[PDB]
Point group: D2
Chain length 267, copies 4
C-alpha cells in the first residue's frame, strides 16, 4: 500500500532530433538551421530575418549560434512563424522572444495552444508541455506577411493540430524563382480519429488538409520532420535530392491515414 504517485516524465526524443548541424542552404535566402531531424528555417532579407519553427526547447542557443554564423544578430530576427505549436517545433519560442527582437505571428488555434505551453493537448493531455509564449499577431487563412520583400502566405491545414499551417513563399535559385512550401505534419500519432469528443470533425479536417497540401505552390517541399518529405539534412549537397512533391507527400499521408482508420475500426 506504500506506492507514491509516479514522477513527472520528461518529453524525450531520438538523438538525431537533438543533433546540431551547421546551416544548410535551401535557396538564395532560405536556410535550414535546426538539427539533423528537426526543421528550423531561417529566411534572410535586406530588412531582417524570419524564423519558421524552432524545434525542441533546448535548441534556442544553437539556433542563435547558427543565426550569428549567418550574419543575423538577435536584433535582426523580426518574425517567428510556426507549422504547429507542439513542443518539438515551437519548443524554444518563449526563450527566443526573450533573447531576440522576434515577434510571433500565428493563427488563433496555434496562438491559444502556444499560450498554454502545449498543455491540455487534444490528444496528449499534459504529456508534452513547453514554455508558454504569446502571439503578437493573429493571422487568418490565406493572409500574407511580408518581410524585406519576401512574401509569406498562410494555408491552414488543420488536423495534426487544429492550428496546423503550411507557409509558402517564393525565393530564388540560379536567377529563377523557387516556390517553397513548408507544409505541416499530416500524421495522427496514436490519435483517436473517429468519434473524438475533443475533435468531432477531425476526419473531415484531415481530408480537407490533404487536398490543401496537394494544391500548394510547390517547387520545393519541406516539412517540420524532414524525413516526412524525404529530406536528409545530413546528406549535404544531396540533402534535398530525394524530396517528395507536395502531391506525393499528401498522397502518402492520406494512404497512411486511411490505413490508420481501418486499424482503429478493427482495434
Amino acid at each position: 500500500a506504500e506506492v507514491p504517485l509516479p514522477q513527472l516524465r520528461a518529453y524525450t526524443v531520438d538523438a538525431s532530433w537533438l543533433q546540431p548541424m551547421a546551416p544548410l542552404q535551401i535557396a538564395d535566402h532560405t536556410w535550414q538551421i535546426g538539427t539533423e531531424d528537426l526543421t528550423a528555417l531561417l529566411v534572410q532579407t535586406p530588412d531582417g530575418a524570419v524564423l519558421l519553427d524552432g524545434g525542441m526547447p533546448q535548441m534556442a542557443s544553437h539556433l542563435l549560434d547558427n543565426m550569428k554564423a549567418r550574419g543575423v544578430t538577435p536584433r535582426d530576427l523580426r518574425l517567428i512563424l510556426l507549422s504547429h505549436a507542439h513542443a518539438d517545433h515551437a519548443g524554444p519560442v518563449a526563450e527566443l522572444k526573450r533573447r531576440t527582437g522576434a515577434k510571433v505571428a500565428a493563427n488563433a488555434e496555434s496562438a491559444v495552444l502556444l499560450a498554454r505551453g502545449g498543455s491540455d493537448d487534444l490528444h496528449f493531455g499534459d504529456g508534452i508541455t513547453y514554455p508558454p509564449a504569446n502571439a503578437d499577431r493573429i493571422v487568418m487563412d490565406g493572409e500574407v506577411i511580408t518581410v524585406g520583400g519576401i512574401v509569406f502566405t498562410a494555408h491552414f491545414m488543420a488536423g495534426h493540430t487544429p492550428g496546423s499551417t503550411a507557409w509558402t513563399w517564393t525565393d530564388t535559385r540560379n536567377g529563377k524563382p523557387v516556390r517553397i512550401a513548408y507544409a505541416d505534419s499530416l500524421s495522427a500519432p496514436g490519435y483517436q480519429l473517429q468519434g473524438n469528443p475533443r475533435y468531432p470533425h477531425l476526419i473531415e479536417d484531415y481530408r480537407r488538409s490533404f487536398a490543401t497540401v496537394r494544391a500548394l505552390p510547390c517547387d520545393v517541399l519541406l516539412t517540420p520532420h524532414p524525413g516526412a518529405s524525404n529530406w536528409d539534412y545530413a546528406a549535404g549537397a544531396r540533402a534535398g535530392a530525394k524530396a517528395l512533391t507536395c502531391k506525393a507527400y499528401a498522397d502518402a499521408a492520406e494512404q497512411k491515414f486511411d490505413g490508420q482508420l481501418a486499424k482503429e475500426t478493427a482495434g
Copy 2:
C-alpha cells in the same frame, strides 16, 4: 564531434512528496488532503470549499478523491489560493480549474508566474515548468476573501518568490477559535542572494518577510513543506504536536538565511 543536445530533464522529487495520504483534520473546517510531504489544505464551509495549494502536477486526481471523501464534489470547490506558484505547490492548478468550479485568487506576481507555468523563473529558468493557469481575481496585500463565512487574509511575504504569500484565517476547535497561519516558504535554495540582477532587493524583501511571518496571528502554523514547520503528516494524532510557532519558524529561517549569505560571500 557527434554529441546531441541533452534530453529535457523532468522535475523529480523525493518519493514522500508524492505519497498519497487520507485527509487529516487540522481544525473543525480545515483538512490536509495532499501527500505526506506536500501540503494541500481544504477548508470546508456551508457555502463551498477552498483549496490552498495543490502540490505537484500529478496530484490533481488524488486531491479530487480526497475532496470527494470529504463530501466535496467538483462543483463545490469555489476557490484556489496559493502560497507561491512553483511546480511543487501550484502544479495541478490548471487541471483542477478544468475539472472543478474553482477560481483562482492570487497577487499579481503569483498570477504572472502561474500564467507562465513557472517558466523563466528568476532563479531556476525553465527547469521547473508546469501547466500554466490564469488567475480569476488579483489580490492586494492585506486584502480579505470570504467564503461561507471563513475569512482569509493575504499577507505578502516576498522572497522565495516575488509573489510569496501567507494566508491566515480563524477556524474553531473545541468551541474555541483557532487562528491558522499558512505561511509560505522562507527558503532560498541555491539562490544568488547578493547583487542578483533579476531580483535586486531580494535581501531586503526576505528580511521584511521574516518580520511579517513573526507577527502573524498564529495559534497554529502550517507550511507548504510540512517539515519546515515541524509537521509530520504521517504521525496521525500527533502530526502537529511538534509544530513550530510562527516566531520560531521566522527565526530559524532568518538564521539559515544569514548563514547562506555568509557562505555566498565566502563562496
Copy 3:
C-alpha cells in the same frame, strides 16, 4: 493650426438595445433575460444555469437581477456561451465572471477576440472595445457541453466574426421536445467583403455559414439581435409568433449578402 486630436467616441446604440425587460419564457428551461433588442438567454437546469450572450457592457446588473428573479443566484451560474465576441453581445462577460461562478466556453477565435476586449477588430479596429475576459474552456466545431442534462452543441459559422458560433440544444414544451437554435449574426455591416487583406476567405466562409445555418436542428430560431429572426421581445405572448425558420433566416441573409457584394463591386 490649433486643432487637438479628437476625443474618444463611446460605442452608442439605439435606446431599445438598452431597454430592460422582465424574463420572457421561450421553453420549459429557456428564458430571454436581456433587453428588448438584445438577446441574453438563460437556460436553467437541476444542476446550475447557463447564459448564452450578455448583450452590452452596462447590462451586467440587469442580467443578475433577472437571474435572481428566476431563482438563480450568482453561484448557480455555471457557464457562459457566446454567439460572437463583439461589445453588444459579450460586453458584460468580464464583470459577470467577477460577480458569479460562471466560466466561459468558446472557440479559439472568439477566445482571442474576447481576450482583446474586442480591440483590433478585423473591420472596426478599436472602435468597439469592451472589458477583456479569458475563456476557461476552448471548444471545437461540433463539440458538446452538457449542463444538468441539457446538451449544447457548437456549430461554427464564421463570417460576421471569425469565431461566430450557433448553439443548439433540445428543451421541452407541452411534453414535446423543442430543438432550439441560437444562430449568430449573418450580417456584414460596412465590411469590405472582396479582397480583404485581414480576412481573405471572408466570402467563402459566409457562404459555408449560410449552408450551416440552413441545416441546423431548428424547431425554434433565436438570434443575438431578435429582429434578425423576426422576434419581438416586447410583444409578450406573441413575441415569437412571427419568428423565421433557420432556412428563411439563412436565405434572407444570403440574399442581402449578394446585394452587398454587387453594391461593393459598383461602389
Copy 4:
C-alpha cells in the same frame, strides 16, 4: 417606467491633453514627443529607441510621426516603458506594438492592469478602459534595462496605481551628465484612501512612495502630467525653466495627500 440603461460614456479629457506638439529636446538623447499636456518621452540611442509612455489611445499616429521626424522608423523602436497603466499614459501601447518593433517592459502590477486594458480599476472600475496589451518582460524593483548604452533603472512607487514606477537614466547636456528622473503621478484623484477593501495598505504605500521620489537621482524631473512638475511644454526654450526638484514634487504631493486624508475623514 420606460428608461433605458445609460449609454457607455467615453473617457474625455481637456483639449490640451490632445494637442499635438513637435518634438521638444530635453537632453542630448531625450525628447518630449507627446502632446502639450501629456508626456511621451523618446530616448534615442545608437542601438535603437525607447519610448516612455504614449499618452492617450488616439495619440499613436502622432507619436509615430514625431518618431519619424526624429529619424526613428517603426523598426527602430525597441522598447516601451510605462509610468503607470492608465488610459491617458498607456493608451496607445497596443497599437504601437502592432505597428512597430517595440516590446514592453513593466512590473507585474502594471502588466496585469495593461493586459486588462485598464478594466476593473481599483478605484474607477471599468470607466477608463483602453486596448489591452501584453508585457514582453517583467521587471523587479531596482532592475535595470540597457538600450544602446543608456541605462534605465526602475523605482517602484506604488500608490496612484499598484504598479506605479519611476524611471531614471543619465543623459548628457553640454558635455555634462544629466540625471533624468521620470517620476510617476503621486495623485489620488477621488480615491477612497482609508479602509479601502481593494487597497488596504494604500496610505502606507503612498508614504513610502513620497520617500522614494524624494531620494531619486534627479538633476531634471519630468512627470506624466507635465503640470505636476511645473513643466510647460508649449513654452519652448523655457519649457523646463520652472520645473520642480524631485524633493519639491514629493513634498507638494504629500501635503496635498495629507489634506485629502483630512477631508476624507471629515467627509
